[PDB]
Amino acid sequence: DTPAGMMMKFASETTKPFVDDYLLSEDVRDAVMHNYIHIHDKDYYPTKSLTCVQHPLDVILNHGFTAGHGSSRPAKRIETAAVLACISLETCQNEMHGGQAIPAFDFYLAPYVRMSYQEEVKNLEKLTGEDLSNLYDAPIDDYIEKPLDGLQGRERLEQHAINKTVNRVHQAMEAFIHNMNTIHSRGGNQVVFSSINYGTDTSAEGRCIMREILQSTYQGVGNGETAIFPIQIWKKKRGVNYLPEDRNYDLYKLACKVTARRFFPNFLNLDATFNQNEKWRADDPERYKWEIATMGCRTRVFEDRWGEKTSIARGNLSFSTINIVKLAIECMGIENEKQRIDMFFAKLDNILDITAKQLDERFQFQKTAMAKQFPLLMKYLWVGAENLKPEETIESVINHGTLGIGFIGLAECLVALIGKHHGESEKAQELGLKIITYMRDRANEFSEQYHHNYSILATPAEGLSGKFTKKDRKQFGVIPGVTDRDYYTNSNHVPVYYKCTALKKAQIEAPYHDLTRGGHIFYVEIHNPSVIESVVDMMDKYNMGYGSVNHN
């Protein structure tokens, strides 16, 4: 409705009918035209843009960043460090069509908590004059606060100096939450996606910054208002937290209390046998670079078939969703069950072949793009973008991305077309695991022949919640139990209308997580912080992954 918002749809409605006939081959055109394959984010097809990336902020903060004609200096304070983090999330958004996230936010804001107070003792000293050159190289327990009830001594300056950074850190983090919640900079939707990760830092500086993050979030933004960004993620690796005899167990009790109030902080299971790495040293500082860090878009980039297994600076190239619900309708006329399942696999075989080539054609289109089109994404943020001339091509470093073959309505696929769905049916549970394994096995075959990184993704319900259903419903009238819901259920998720307990959902949805390596989420909808620990307790027994709790 805004002048900037209405300008974007003029370009979209112009460039969307253009790409259909002048960029696609005849076979993919018919498959796309016949409502079989969906191309996510087709508006930016000519621009040759990528999906997302995990922001490395340690490099940006230590040297600043110069995008366009705007330049900045390295941060030397808590206020300067937090504010520059927001800008790094604002410039890159205009160069992509997805979202941003901060991996291990705790580690980044920790030297400057000390450094803002390290030189503060030199300003609190000149009033007195005594050479107090010992307030930095000492083991601080928690950067604690006191009621200031008649403190007295020479070392009263030592307690006053540390008292100066706790208030300043609290003020510093208020800027970060407000900046990412009120600055409308993106074209169109006018909101920049963001996400941060914290919960696995135990140092004195890290414990202070993590507490204030929870303390500031407990208060809100402006006047007692829950923030929408950034999305909060909590780590629960065993041996650092989640155990009573742990250094960070005290904050974990507070974190569940904050979650009970604002419902913002999500949890990530670092013990899943696929969210697990062999290079986690307990003593090496900055425990990131070998951990799992997700986003708000259920995007998971962990294992690379050519490179290193990490989630830093990587992301998706582009992903397409395959309508498997439609294929079952065409095979509903076969009387013999063995023949019926034979046809569905044959029909699924043809669509999968086109989609692998369909993603391959868009990949070839994107590799010709120049690095000058992404001033910040292809300069500091991407994996191998530190050496890329503006006039070069992205074909060298574009391979460290994920092409996603997603699906929708697995429950809708089997609810009435083939018997029952994967809820109150053990036979359908075996059938459902067979199909996803069939897609997973084919994606392995596509990876060998097309030489890419194909993964099965649980596509978030955003932009494709009702598009598929309406088009197919008209073609096939009213199919009872399938095309009478106006929305297809999300990937490998128990349908909402099927009543079940949290324990039962954990058991049913656990096996799918090892299959959908491209992204998954566990959703629990429902005061006491303990009940939050119940979710991670059941997530502990069964190998699951990313988890979230909502109220609505």
Please give the residue ranges that form the binding site for its own copies (CB under 8 A).
1-4, 6-8, 10-15, 18, 22, 44, 46-49, 64, 66-73, 79, 83, 87, 90-91, 93-97, 126-127, 148, 156-157, 160, 175, 178, 181-191, 221-223, 225, 228, 370, 372-375
41 binds, among ligand DGT, its own copies, ligand ATP, none (CB under 5 to 8 A by kind): ligand ATP
Encoded tokens for 177: 């939450």
Residues 451-470 that bind ligand DGT (CB under 6 A): none
2 binds, among ligand DGT, ligand ATP, its own copies, none (CB under 5 to 8 A by kind): its own copies
- Where residue 267 falls (left for φ over 0; alpha for ψ -120 to 50; beta otherwise) is beta
**CA 293 to CA 233: how far, in whole Å?**
8
Closest approach of ligand ATP to the CB of residue 412, in Å: 17
| 475 binds ligand DGT, rule: CB under 6 A | no
403-415 in b/e form (b: 16+ CB < 10 A) is bbbbbbbbbbbbb
From 524, 534, 57, select the one nearest 289 (Cα to Cα): 57
**Of all helices (H) and strands (E), which one includes residue 376?**
none
**CA 542 to CA 546: how far, in whole Å?**
13
**Region near ligand ATP per CB under 6 A, out of 224-232, 424-432, 462-470, 527-535:** 462-470
The total of other beta-carbon atoms located within 10 Å of residue 447's CB is 16
Encoded tokens for 341: 């399942």
Number of residues in contact with ligand DGT under rule CB under 6 A: 17
**CA 520 to CA 69: how far, in whole Å?**
40
**Region near ligand ATP per CB under 6 A, out of 12-20, 189-197, 492-500, 544-552:** 189-197
Closest approach of ligand ATP to the CB of residue 319, in Å: 8
Binding test (CB under 6 A) with ligand DGT, winner from 78, 87, 233, 327: 87
In this structure, is the dihedral angle defined by the CA atoms of residues 20, 466, 266 and 453, taken in order, positive or negative? negative
459 binds, among its own copies, ligand ATP, ligand DGT, none (CB under 5 to 8 A by kind): ligand ATP
Closest approach of ligand DGT to the CB of residue 77, in Å: 6
Encoded tokens for 380: 């500091």
| 219 binds ligand DGT, rule: CB under 6 A | no
**Of all helices (H) and strands (E), which one includes residue 443?**
helix 426-450
Tokens 């425990």 found at: 287
**CA 522 to CA 548: how far, in whole Å?**
6
* Cβ distance to ligand ATP smaller for residue 97 or 237: 97
**CA 257 to CA 242: how far, in whole Å?**
14
185 binds, among its own copies, ligand DGT, ligand ATP, none (CB under 5 to 8 A by kind): its own copies
**CA 319 to CA 253: how far, in whole Å?**
38
* Cβ distance to its own copies smaller for residue 34 or 156: 156
The residue length of the chain stands at 552
* Cβ distance to its own copies smaller for residue 167 or 437: 167
189 binds, among its own copies, ligand ATP, ligand DGT, none (CB under 5 to 8 A by kind): its own copies
Residue 337: how many CA atoms within 13 Å on its side-chain side? 3
338 binds, among ligand ATP, ligand DGT, its own copies, none (CB under 5 to 8 A by kind): none
Which residue number places its CB atom closest to ligand ATP?
Answer: 463
75 binds, among its own copies, ligand ATP, ligand DGT, none (CB under 5 to 8 A by kind): ligand DGT
Closest approach of ligand ATP to the CB of residue 314, in Å: 15
* Cβ distance to its own copies smaller for residue 31 or 162: 162
Closest approach of its own copies to the CB of residue 130, in Å: 13
Encoded tokens for 141: 């327990």
Who contacts 244 (Cβ-Cβ below 8 Å, separation ≥6)?
none
CB–CB of 29/17 below 8 Å?
A: no
Tokens 């259903």 found at: 469
Closest approach of ligand DGT to the CB of residue 172, in Å: 9
Strands, E assignment, 185-251: 195-198, 231-235
* Cβ distance to ligand DGT smaller for residue 190 or 528: 190
Who contacts 378 (Cβ-Cβ below 8 Å, separation ≥6)?
95, 371, 385, 388, 394
| 77 binds ligand DGT, rule: CB under 6 A | yes
The total of other beta-carbon atoms located within 10 Å of residue 464's CB is 18
Amino acid identity, residue 339? Q
| 109 binds ligand DGT, rule: CB under 6 A | no
Binding test (CB under 6 A) with ligand ATP, winner from 62, 128, 182, 190: 190
Binding test (CB under 6 A) with ligand ATP, winner from 193, 363, 488, 512: 193
98 binds, among ligand DGT, its own copies, ligand ATP, none (CB under 5 to 8 A by kind): ligand ATP
Cross-sheet strand order for the sheet of 454-458: 37-39, 315-322, 401-407, 454-458
393 beta partners: 370
| 296 binds ligand ATP, rule: CB under 6 A | yes
| 97 binds ligand ATP, rule: CB under 6 A | yes
Contact characters 35-74, ligand DGT, x per CB under 6 A: -------------------------------------xxx
Residues 12-41 that bind ligand ATP (CB under 6 A): 40-41
CA distances, 370 to each of 41, 373, 390, 552 (Å): 20, 6, 6, 44
Binding test (CB under 6 A) with ligand DGT, winner from 5, 187, 222, 285: 222
Strand, helix or coil at 200? Answer: coil
**CA 175 to CA 86: how far, in whole Å?**
9
**Region near ligand DGT per CB under 6 A, out of 178-186, 229-237, 388-396, 497-505:** 178-186
The total of other beta-carbon atoms located within 10 Å of residue 456's CB is 25
Interacting residue ranges for ligand DGT, rule: CB under 6 A: 72-77, 80, 83-84, 87, 171, 174-175, 178-179, 182, 222
Residues that bind ligand ATP (CB under 6 A): 40-41, 97-99, 190-191, 193, 296-297, 459-460, 462-464
